[model samples]
Target: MFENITAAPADPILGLADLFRADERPGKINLGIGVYKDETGKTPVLTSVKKAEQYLLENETTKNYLGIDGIPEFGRCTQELLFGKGSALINDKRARTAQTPGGTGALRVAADFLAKNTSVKRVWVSNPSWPNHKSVFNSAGLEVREYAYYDAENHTLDFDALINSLNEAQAGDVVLFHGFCHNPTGIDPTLEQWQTLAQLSVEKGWLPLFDFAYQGFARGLEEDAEGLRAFAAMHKELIVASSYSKNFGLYNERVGACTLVAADSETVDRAFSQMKAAIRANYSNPPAHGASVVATILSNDALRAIWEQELTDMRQRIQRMRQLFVNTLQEKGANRDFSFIIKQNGMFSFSGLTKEQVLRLREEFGVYAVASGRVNVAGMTPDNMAPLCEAIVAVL
Candidate 1:
């Protein structure tokens, strides 16, 4: 019965990752995927995560199913991360969270909930967002629209264009914003810009959906949450999809949460009832292990401090690499000024290389990057920096 089915295209990001895995070049570099690599070119498990697992190995006694929303402690900890501790929203119980399989899972659950529950039929995302944002939203039967975000020529946020696009949004639309460390581009708006956008949300009467995947990777955790906090303060309601993948180094464990904030605790309770129904229809419930480890670390004083320090180290390393990348490019006598790279935030950057140059970098020098020039800055190490610079300079 399925013999006539045709094969779908491989995912652009993961497909390149597959090709990178198959290539046997001794010094081949993979800047394609979004995983964070340490100075040794490895995605190491955080020490805090390992310690939490050790504790869980001894203390966790159940393989039983979690509730449709997963662990309550995990939700509580997730809220603290998103909002400051003692946030009035939490004090008044204005937010409800559902633990999901991953950030993508959280997004899907949010999309499904929005589609199934509200009259809103569309979601506005950044033009150069992570490729799967459109796919996930569209799969849930919502029309995905693009808002202006990046200016490829100037290598900056196109704030004017962004405001124009968002201005076109009607009252019943959903708008997606990256809470921090925007994927692919690594460029985020200024705090002033975030405030303006929050005000616009109020004026436009649109629901906000925040895709908060790389929180601790940008700045300090609280500092990174400033934009979302701005929206939370103004809007009567919003959606947050929080991920522990990059921050906790728990990629495969698939732990994240879908949080809905409303004007009142009773409204949140009713909204979350629909969210739980969506979860019941989708995956039934989230896994136990990753969420348990996250809750354990966040609830403990010593372990939480350790996690923050590790996260700080990761952020600083990426910052160093961003600077090194520009310095090496200039040292190699490339024609263009790459000083813009260091100013961008997070693990990825839009390198401004053309499609032909990116292709040449992959085939000629074994340096894999997306065709639109998105490079994973965390993939660079001291050992790989020189050769990576050499390849990029050559292409330039």
Candidate 2:
């Protein structure tokens, strides 16, 4: 059965890890994958998460399976974190959250749920979105379409083209928005632009689905959520996929949730039943430990404080790296002005390198970057900055 079947091509982003590991070269840099890295070139587990795990080891009693929706507290805590404590979405009981395997899991569940439960037949994602976005929706048997987002030449968000493309969406379509920290292209709309998009959603009558994987990676948690909240304020029905993988450094733990806000509590109950059914038919029930740890940390004052501080540290470090990277690139006498990179947010930025340049950088300098020119800013460190800049300048 396997003889005639061909192997799938390497994942555009993840395949770089394997290549990096196989390389025998010293000081080879990996700027392909999106994982966060510190100055020491390691993804650190959050102090808050460590303390929560210590507590759970001592106090958590049951190893029994969670319900299809997972812990009730986990859902509540997730909602508070996303929509704020006094949000009407919570007080009115309109939002229902189901814990999932990871951010990817949340997206997959949302894809399936929409395919099975709603009239939405197409999902409109940005042109240069995380490559996985296309695969996830297409795998669920839905049509994946693109909306203009980035201005490649200018290296910024193309608001006019974006809105024009979105204007073509039919009613009942699902439009995917990066909650913050857009992957591949780190550019995001301003708050005013978010409000404009929300208005467009209303005028166009399309559903908004926010992929909020890097909640704290852009700015402060509250500030980063402003775009999603703008939609929440205007749209009665919305969908959000939340992830703790980057924010809490719970990458391997696969912590994430699919949260839905309906028109009313009764509608929420009906939708939630189907969301639970989606999970049941898919993964059955979410794993307990990660959600348990998240709930423990969020609910306790001490742990929550520690988590906030740790998250701030990560956010600030990435910002510093972004500054350092652009400065070093210019100092290395790169041909183009890289000042735009400092304006972008999160772990990713398009380096304006063409496929040929990217290939040259990898093969010649041992610097790994995605063929699309997407490089992870967090992958840069004080030690690697000089060499990385030199490599970039060489390719330029």
Candidate 3:
């Protein structure tokens, strides 16, 4: 019955991992996936997470289902982490939260809810966004549109073009914004630009959905969330999808949340009920382990402090790698100015390499990058930087 289905192409990032695994070269490096690897080239489990697990093991509890909303503590912790703990939006009964399988899950739930209730037929995303953003919305029967972003010539945001495109959007159109650490292109809007975006959202009556998968990976937890805070302060109606997979290093655990900020308590209650229904129709509820570990770490003062320190270390390491990559490229007399990589925040950098160069790097030098020239800055380490830079220069 299923024989008519055609085979699908491998995922760009994951396929690179498979290729690297098959390569016999001992010095091969994989820089395609947006996962954080320490100086030792290992994805380390956070010390705080380890402690949380120990505590949970000792305290003991029944392995009970958490219903549609999942763990209440997970929702609370995620909201506090995304929007500041004392945020007026949270204090008032205008915000409601639900746990999802991951950021993708959260986005899907939000997409479904919006499709059913709102008049939004088309959603606007960045010109070069994470591929899955378009995939998710398209799968849900929503028309996805691309707004201007990531000017390759200058390696910066095309603010004028962006504003022009947004101005064309009608009221109630969904405008997706990266909360922090923009996916393929690491470039983000300046504070003034964010202010403009908030104002535009209000004026255009566009629904702002913030995708916050890389919080704490950019500047820091509190600093990175400034966009979400700015939007919340400006508009009472907002949708936020946050993930702990990157920050908490819990990729396999699939932890994330979807939050809706309504204008009033009645709207909040209605939105909450709608989200619950969506979740029930989908995965029902999130898993227990990852949420429990994240909640425990964030709620406890000492553990939270330790986790913050670890997060800082990860952020600094990626920044250092960015600097090293750019400096080495310059030293090699490459005509291109990679200085933008240094200024760009987050785990990945939009290297501006063409599709041909990306393939050449993979074929000749055994160095993998996303087809769109996106390299995972967090995937670089001191030992591997030299070869990666050499491969990139060769491709250039």
The best candidate in terms of lDDT: 1
- TM-score of candidate 3 versus the correct structure, residues matched by position: 0.97
TM-scores of the models, in the given order?
A: 0.98, 0.98, 0.97
Superposed by TM-score, candidate 2 places the C-alpha of residue 204 at a distance from the truth, in angstroms, of 1.3
Give the per-residue lDDT digits (tens) of candidate 2, residues 1-396: 788999999998889899999999998999988888988999987889989999999997889899998989999999988999899899999999999999899999999999999988899999999899999999899999999999988888999999889888999999999998888788999999999999989888999999998988887888999999999988989999989988888888889999999999999899989989989999999999888899999999999999999888888998999899988888999878899999898998888899999999888999999999999888889999999999999877
**Reference-based lDDT, each prediction:** 0.93, 0.91, 0.87
List pairs with backbone clashes in candidate 2: none
**Local accuracy of candidate 1 as per-residue lDDT tens digits, 231-313:** 99998899999999999989999999999999999999999999999999988988999999999999999999999999999
Stretches of candidate 1 off by over 4 Å are none
Clash count for each candidate, listed in order shown: 1, 0, 0
RMSD of each: 0.9, 1.0, 1.2
Which sequence of candidate numbers ranks them by lDDT, best first? 1, 2, 3
Worst-scoring 10-residue span by lDDT in model 2: 213-222
Model 1: lDDT of residue 256: 95
